[PDB]
DNA sequence: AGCCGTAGGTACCTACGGCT
DNA sequence: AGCCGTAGGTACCTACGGCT
């Protein structure tokens, strides 16, 4: 990808790719990172919900393509863990509720198209500090120290426990049937 | 330093966070003031910067920059476009913003870039904001803790139903049509005199929606189902007539279109039908709309074709007739709820009662505080020479304050007001001026206590203020409701 | 329908455009070094109190404010100007203190203006210092609803410190940045010798000093530029050759020429290698980091001559780049090609006027305030009679007139007395009035001393410049090699 | 052009086309106009300087093409006045100095590629009021009344007097030789 | 060439629900 | 269908002069 700012090392075991929302966040991320082991792929805001889209639309989507190209594993039946270019794929959305949404959209894609990647423990969630509308609000050094620096950062490693439950969760939250999603919200929402 | 995060847990917590935020703080209006956050923040920002109707227009970029910095931590395009719609007389039945310059058209043209346009409050918006500084509504912290913002506006007219709402949330959406303000206030008045009023009786005041774009509604059954249940389909039809154009030929002339239909797009659709031979008898199609003429779309009919047949076809096959699917979801006590016409009016009236009660309570606290200060000023002027000498013999404020309080039985606040007094307040007619203000205040205090002592008196005050707004801002029905 | 001659129309419309771009867009003023857009940005920061000691303000608010009040052009022009001012690879002395993504040497843009925040740098305080003490002429804004400065006080020589580049119509400008210590030393020299030569001035100002460091090759281009306003200056990357193990070597670049895009320079080298237009390179990496600074590594094939490869890179890529000096600035509102001495002379003359005007202002204001305090002192001296006079007056007007009659007071003094709060009559407050008055009398005589002696005024200019030099002056970054 | 908002009438004798800077101006213009006889073509800011550009690039430029297509006359040797779709081409750039610049750029194109159009008196200059950054700052009705309404407006008809002088003018002001333009400015500029 | 930096100007991706 | 309206996100035409 043109947008992908790759790292220098060509050894997947030690390389990491950070997915960020766009160029506002990408700029701080590029400046603060350790370019030997840390790649950056800026997205472009809300990504396609693959649970609601048909294959043709998915495979034509630019952000989806760039992620598949960057990962190098292929997708679906053709997925090959051995061809992974990074052993850490780190979701680093902005620290707002919309960042959370984008994270659900990214996890839906990984689950439906690259599930072995999750099983292998290769998918992580960054934990940037709260109070900044976007990473582009942070200085590069502050983003490095709090979020990207392996010495101080706290990553969450994404774990799949029960695949049947996960199937139902993706389907309910992300699928085309509104009613079940509505029922979920009513059953779980804790309001004012 | 790596903890494990279960994918199922993550999905459920992240999604619920998003969904709830869109529901309570983005896409759905509050039942009390009819506003979503972005609109409320826009109007509040206009208020805080004194951008009232009597003042000159302010630059759009300044308004947007201010609202984005202080209250609305989202994209500038969201804020500007919200403000633009509020200024459009084809979007808002009672426009909330007064815009100067290119603010878009019915053809789906956008506004000019925000650097070119300018804006202020409309007169009616003053009524949304009236009494906001008299402790009528609860303020809250802004997103970063550096500002305060209103949780809800006083909303001295029923804005949800007057201007309507449409929003796509998560798990749900809303679609509330606009209404005639005279009708609505009449309905509130009726309700205020009869808690047990029926929907059918309320409909004696509120005949149905009243769109800024006028046009026709077909039948009352969709209206009635919507008002009874919160959901119903309402058939909207363009205003069209058949007329001669010479040499024995005719044309259909359309002068009003359904609410929320894009005129240029509707025209393209008719053109497409003709081109693809899905409709017989049309020989020409022109948009003759102008500032002077108003909306005018002309459909020429082939000599000896039946123009009424063609018109009926057009209603069936294009947006010339369009459905409004009512789905009245609003935030009630911070939760999304499907509401009928009566519930919407009940929540509104209850908000008015609280606003006017709280305003009365505030006015009373303030009047009592001011009475207290004047009692202290009375004492100071009656004993001025001793007051001055007490202050002069004091080294500091603290000493003067303490001495004034012991010697003259003054509170801390009275003593402070005396030390803050300018020498010009010692002129000869000031003592009489204090006495006059004090007498008027005691009377005012009594008037306020009367209101808070009698719920009927409170309620009648609400009715009177609503009546006044109705008489000043109420207007004629635009949309015609025809029997099916 | 009147007729318009095409020739007339073209000449008048074009001249209108051309002149506007010249005097009010692309060219900096000799006195403060600024173009309109930059001046309006900094003025806007000042007027909204966005000083270094206060928190960062939202970029959108700064931009919206500047656009509405002062700068009737596109928001992108305003925001991008402000961004550059915050970039330490663009400005030798950055004028804006930015928080968030403000772009990089690789030509990455700043974040969207909604994300970033900004305030003045400490040195910008010196650009704006005394702007409210009638030091500079204000003018009407574009629509007549505001006032804006024609020029900033500019208490350091900003044109030469930060430089300027601008494309106008019929002409352009290209002024390199300079070391602030060197510049102030040069101003000080000039202030003691109006007849100083360019050559002598160059004993203080060795040449340009780019924020990006690097090397300049030779002095002859510098000398021509300083003498005539025009000259070609050869810039080079800072590059060394070092071992990397196994008998192999690499070229390591740690500084690049001013205004060169690092990523673009690297792609150019990659291209040359790919198209076999350069021999001997086996690898190319940008190892730049926040912690290590700029580091571009070019691996050389074992036993190849790394010096030969380096010289080729200078020939074939921006690793060596020229700066064509073309020192055009607005002098008395007109575009003019100026040499180094003219630039310094206009700057020093601006400082003298600023400090004189500031002195005259401070004096008027001190005398006004002394007059008011004389009124308060009279009132305290006769407080009983003051009170009586006011109490026996039915209106403010009558009280004013009686105070003026009884106590020989001016209208301003009488109004000050009537505005005095009763708390001003406590012991500590009374002493405060007396103390302020005594301090003011001393201040007034200090000011009068300055305005009485041109040499004292000039010395004050020198002292204030010297103070700025000591606080903000820094080391030379660019090395000038013979 | 896609951008072109044409008039009803198909009779060139009574039709007028207004060229405006962009859609900000275009919107007010479209709302204020008389759509029976008044067409509007919004441009996109600064247009190509045809005096400095190569012919291939000229003929590839979208704005140039849109204007040629809308006018219907063809260009150069193929110019045919009889095929004009409008007998008034009205330049209506913003009333700021950049509007003036765009006007000179438009006139350069007309003079070099459609000179008979000028000779025939078909080229006019609108005179919008001066206080507004852009036409999009004006209300539709105020733009109609002051600038577009044939009853009150004051159009300037562009007249070519001396073609040799005009040639030299366009070459000097708009051509690639900077020095003569510089000399013109110095000889004519009246500074404060 | 094609870059530098102030200027004039604009177009599409995505989520989300309901219509039907 | 693809549109309604708040949200996340971004790219490229043009003029102008002087240097390569
Ligand atoms: O017009 C176009 C056409 C194509 C295109 N492609 C990519 C792209 O990014 N853009 C494209 N565009 C446009 C631009 C998008 N536009 C969105 C709005 C933004 N506004 C920023 C802003 C302005 C102001 C703010 C805040 N933010 O506060 C008050 C002062 C004014 C500027 C960029
Ligand atoms: Mn974001
Ligand atoms: Mn313009
Ligand atoms: Na229909």
Scanning the structure block, which residue is given the tokens 């309080």? B405
Mutual angle of helices D163-174 and D178-188, in 10-degree steps: 100
Residues 94-153 of chain B: which lie with beta carbon within 7 Å of strand F? 108
DSSP element (H, E) containing B202: helix B199-202
Pocket-testing residue among C114, C115, C116, C118, ligand 1, by greatest number of atoms within 8 A of Cβ: C114
Task: Give yes or no for a contact between B23 and B336, defined as CB atoms under 8 angstroms apart.
Answer: yes
The candidate with the shortest Cα–Cα distance to C328, out of D104, D187, D186, is: D186
Cα separation of the two ends of chain A = 45
What's the burial of C365, exposed, middle or buried (CB within 10 Å: 0-12/13-18/19+)? middle
The length of chain D is: 192
Phi, then psi, of D156 in degrees rounded to 5:
-100, 125
Is the CB of B343 within 6 Å of ligand 1? no
| Cα separations in angstroms, B59 against B51, B172, C64, C78, D24 | 10, 36, 9, 16, 15
User: Within 7 Å: CB of D53 and strand F?
Assistant: yes
Alpha carbons within 13 A on the beta-carbon side of B202: 24
Alpha-helical runs (H) found in B89-150: 123-129
Sheet with strand A38-42: strands edge to edge: A38-42, A16-20, A88-91, A123-125, A156-159, B3-6
Q: State the Cα–Cα distance between residues B77 and B114, nearest whole angstrom.
A: 9
3-state secondary structure (DSSP) of residue C408: coil
Q: Tokens representing C324? A: 């064509």
Q: Taking CA B142 as the corner, what is the angle to CA B138 and CA B147, rounded to the nearest 5 degrees?
A: 90
Q: State the Cα–Cα distance between residues A95 and A131, nearest whole angstrom.
A: 8
C-alpha B400, offset from chain centre:
51
Determine what percent of chain D falls in helix, strand and coil, rounding each to the nearest 5: 50, 10, 40
Phi, then psi, of B295 in degrees rounded to 5:
-65, 130
Q: Do A185 and B17 touch (CB under 8 A)?
A: no
Phi-psi region of B333 (alpha: psi -120 to 50; beta: other; left: phi over 0): left
Q: State the Cα–Cα distance between residues B198 and B185, nearest whole angstrom.
A: 16
User: Within 7 Å: CB of A137 and strand F?
Assistant: no
Q: Tokens representing C365? A: 């204001």
Scanning the structure block, which residue is given the tokens 């005396």? B418
- F2 C1': nearest CA residue: B265
C-alpha A153, offset from chain centre:
17
Q: Hey, of B423, B427, B428, B432, which one would you mutate to test binding to chain C, going by the most C CBs within 10 A of its CB?
A: B423
Residue A124 alpha carbon to ligand 2 centre in Å: 19
Of D111, D154, D181, the CB nearest to C6: D111
The candidate with the shortest Cα–Cα distance to C436, out of C375, C361, C356, is: C375
3-state secondary structure (DSSP) of residue D150: coil
Residue D176 known to be catalytic: no
Q: What is the largest CA-CA distance in chain C?
A: 107
- The DSSP secondary structure of C135-182, one letter per residue, reads -S-EEE-TTSS-EEESS---SS-HHHHH-EEEE-SS-EEEE----HHH
Q: State the Cα–Cα distance between residues C470 and C76, nearest whole angstrom.
A: 37
Restricting to D residues 27-46, those with a Cβ less than 8 Å away from any Cβ of B are 27-28, 30-36
Nearest nt to the A60 alpha carbon by C1': E13
Restricting to B residues 402-441, those with a Cβ less than 8 Å away from any Cβ of C are 418-424, 426-429
Q: State the Cα–Cα distance between residues C40 and D9, nearest whole angstrom.
A: 49
Pocket-testing residue among C63, C71, C72, ligand 1, by greatest number of atoms within 8 A of Cβ: C63
Of C60, C420, C428, the CB nearest to B65: C60
Q: Do D136 and B289 touch (CB under 8 A)?
A: no
Q: Tokens representing B128? A: 């949304």
Annotated catalytic residues of A are 21, 94, 96, 98
Q: Is A6 annotated as a binding residue?
A: no
Phi, then psi, of D39 in degrees rounded to 5:
-95, 155
User: Within 7 Å: CB of C112 and strand F?
Assistant: yes
Residue B200 alpha carbon to ligand 1 centre in Å: 50
Q: State the Cα–Cα distance between residues D172 and D165, nearest whole angstrom.
A: 10
Q: Hey, of D96, D102, D109, D168, which one would you mutate to test binding to chain C, going by the most C CBs within 10 A of its CB?
A: D96
Q: Hey, of B99, B100, B116, which one would you mutate to test binding to chain D, going by the most D CBs within 10 A of its CB?
A: B116
The length of chain B is: 484
Residue D94 known to be catalytic: yes
Resolution (Å units): 2.3
Task: Give yes or no for a contact between B106 and B263, defined as CB atoms under 8 angstroms apart.
Answer: yes
C-alpha A178, offset from chain centre:
24
Residues 6+ apart with CB under 8 A from B84: B97, B99, B103, B104, B110, B111, B117
Residue A46 alpha carbon to ligand 2 centre in Å: 9
Alpha-helical runs (H) found in B26-88: 37-48, 60-70, 76-86
Pocket-testing residue among B42, B49, B64, B72, ligand 1, by greatest number of atoms within 8 A of Cβ: B64
Q: Taking CA D145 as the corner, what is the angle to CA D144 and CA D148, rounded to the nearest 5 degrees?
A: 45
Nearest nt to the D60 alpha carbon by C1': F13
Q: State the Cα–Cα distance between residues C168 and C26, nearest whole angstrom.
A: 5
Q: Tokens representing D85? A: 């779709």
Closest chain C residue to the Cα of D185, Cα to Cα: C15
Residues 6+ apart with CB under 8 A from C27: C35, C164, C166, C168, C173, C328, C329, C330, C335
C-alpha B193, offset from chain centre:
25
Domain ranges of chain D: 1-160
Q: State the Cα–Cα distance between residues B244 and A91, nearest whole angstrom.
A: 67
Q: Do C72 and D118 touch (CB under 8 A)?
A: no
Q: State the Cα–Cα distance between residues A15 and A31, nearest whole angstrom.
A: 17
What's the burial of C248, exposed, middle or buried (CB within 10 Å: 0-12/13-18/19+)? middle
Q: Tokens representing B149? A: 């913002």
Q: State the Cα–Cα distance between residues B3 and A61, nearest whole angstrom.
A: 32
Q: Which residue, judged by its Cα, is nearest atom 27 of ligand 1?
A: B76
- The DSSP secondary structure of C336-390, one letter per residue, reads EE--HHHHHHHHHHHHHHHHHHHHHHHHHHHHHHHHHHHHHHHHHHTHHHHHHHH
Query: How many CB pairs below 8 A link B and C?
Result: 110
Mutual angle of helices A163-174 and A178-188, in 10-degree steps: 100
Q: State the Cα–Cα distance between residues C413 and C391, nearest whole angstrom.
A: 18
Residues 6+ apart with CB under 8 A from B149: B40, B41, B44, B70, B71, B139, B140, B141, B142
Is the CB of C60 within 6 Å of ligand 1? yes
Q: State the Cα–Cα distance between residues D29 and D16, nearest whole angstrom.
A: 13
Q: Taking CA A77 as the corner, what is the angle to CA A76 and CA A82, rounded to the nearest 5 degrees?
A: 90
- The DSSP secondary structure of B433-469, one letter per residue, reads HHHHHHHHHHHHHHHHHHHHH-HHHHHHHHHHHHHHH
C-alpha C190, offset from chain centre:
21
Is the CB of B64 within 6 Å of ligand 1? yes
The length of chain A is: 192
Task: Give yes or no for a contact between C35 and C27, defined as CB atoms under 8 angstroms apart.
Answer: yes
CB contact burial C328-341 (16+ within 10 A = b; e otherwise)? bbbbeeebeebbbb
Mutual angle of helices B430-453 and B455-473, in 10-degree steps: 100
Q: How many CB atoms lie within 10 A of CB B4?
A: 10
Is the CB of C62 within 6 Å of ligand 1? no
Strand duo B480-482 + B216-218: pairing: parallel
């Amino acid at each position: 990808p043109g947008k992908l700012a790759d790292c220098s090392s060509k050894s997947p075991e030690e390389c990491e790719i950070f997915l960020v929302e766009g160029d506002s966040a990408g700029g701080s991320t590029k400046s603060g990172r350790d370019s030997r082991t840390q790649a950056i792929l800026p997205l472009r805001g809300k990504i396609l919900n693959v649970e609601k889209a048909r294959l043709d639309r998915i495979l034509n989507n630019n952000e989806i393509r760039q992620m598949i190209t960057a990962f190098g594993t292929g997708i679906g039946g053709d997925f090959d863990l051995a061809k992974a270019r990074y052993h850490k794929i780190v979701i680093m959305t902005d620290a707002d509720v919309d960042g959370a949404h984008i994270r659900t959209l990214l996890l839906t894609f990984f689950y439906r198209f690259m599930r072995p990647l999750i099983e292998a423990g290769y998918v992580y969630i960054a934990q940037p500090p709260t109070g900044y509308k976007g990473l582009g609000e942070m200085n590069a050094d502050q983003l490095w120290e709090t979020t990207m620096n392996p010495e101080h950062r706290a990553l969450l490693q994404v774990k799949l426990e029960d695949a049947i439950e996960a199937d139902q969760t993706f389907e309910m939250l992300m699928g085309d049937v509104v009613e079940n999603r509505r029922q979920f919200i009513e059953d779980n929402a804790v309001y004012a | 330093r790596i903890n494990e995060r279960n994918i199922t847990s993550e999905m459920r917590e992240s999604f619920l966070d998003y969904a709830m935020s869109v529901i309570v703080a983005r896409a759905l209006p509050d039942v009390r003031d009819g506003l979503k956050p972005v609109h409320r923040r826009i109007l509040y920002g206009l208020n805080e910067q004194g951008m009232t109707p009597d003042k000159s227009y302010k630059k759009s970029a300044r308004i947007v920059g201010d609202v984005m910095g202080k209250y609305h931590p989202h994209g500038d395009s969201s804020i500007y476009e919200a403000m633009v719609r509020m200024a459009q007389d084809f979007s808002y039945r009672y426009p909330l913003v007064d815009g100067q310059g290119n603010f878009g058209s019915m053809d789906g043209d956008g506004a000019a870039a925000m650097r070119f346009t300018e804006a202020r409050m409309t007169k009616i918006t003053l009524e949304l904001l009236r009494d906001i500084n008299k402790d009528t509504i609860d303020f809250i912290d802004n997103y970063d803790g550096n500002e305060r913002e209103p949780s809800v506006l006083p909303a001295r007219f029923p804005n949800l139903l007057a201007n309507g709402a449409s929003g796509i949330a998560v798990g749900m959406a809303t679609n509330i049509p606009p209404h005639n303000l005279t009708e609505l206030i009449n309905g509130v008045l009726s309700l205020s005199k009869n808690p047990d009023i029926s929907i059918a009786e309320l409909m004696e005041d509120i005949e149905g929606p009243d769109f800024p774009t006028a046009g026709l509604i077909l039948g009352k059954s969709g209206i009635r189902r919507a008002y009874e249940t919160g959901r119903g389909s309402i058939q909207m039809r363009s205003r069209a007539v058949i007329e001669e154009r010479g040499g024995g030929r005719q044309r259909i002339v359309v002068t009003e279109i359904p609410f929320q239909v894009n005129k240029a797009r509707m025209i393209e659709k008719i053109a497409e039908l003709v081109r693809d031979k899905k409709i017989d008898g049309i020989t020409d199609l022109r948009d003759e709309t102008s500032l002077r003429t108003g909306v005018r779309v002309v459909i020429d009919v082939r000599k000896d074709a039946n123009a009424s047949v063609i018109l009926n076809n057009l209603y069936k096959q294009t947006p010339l007739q369009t459905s409004f699917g009512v789905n009245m979801i609003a935030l009630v006590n911070g939760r999304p709820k499907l509401i009928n016409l009566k519930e919407a009016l009940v929540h509104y009236l209850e908000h008015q009662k609280t606003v006017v009660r709280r305003r009365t309570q505030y006015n009373l606290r303030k009047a009592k505080d001011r009475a207290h200060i004047l009692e202290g000023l009375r004492i100071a002027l009656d004993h001025i020479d001793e007051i001055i000498s007490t202050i002069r013999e004091s080294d500091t404020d603290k000493v003067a304050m303490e001495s004034l309080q012991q010697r003259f039985k003054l509170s801390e606040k009275q003593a402070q007001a005396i030390l803050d007094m300018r020498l010009r307040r010692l002129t000869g007619l000031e003592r009489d001026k204090i006495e006059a203000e004090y007498n008027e205040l005691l009377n005012y205090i009594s008037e306020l206590e009367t209101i808070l002592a009698d719920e009927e008196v409170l309620l009648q005050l609400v009715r009177d203020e609503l009546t006044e707004i109705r008489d000043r801002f109420g207007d004629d029905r635009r949309t015609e409701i025809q029997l099916g």
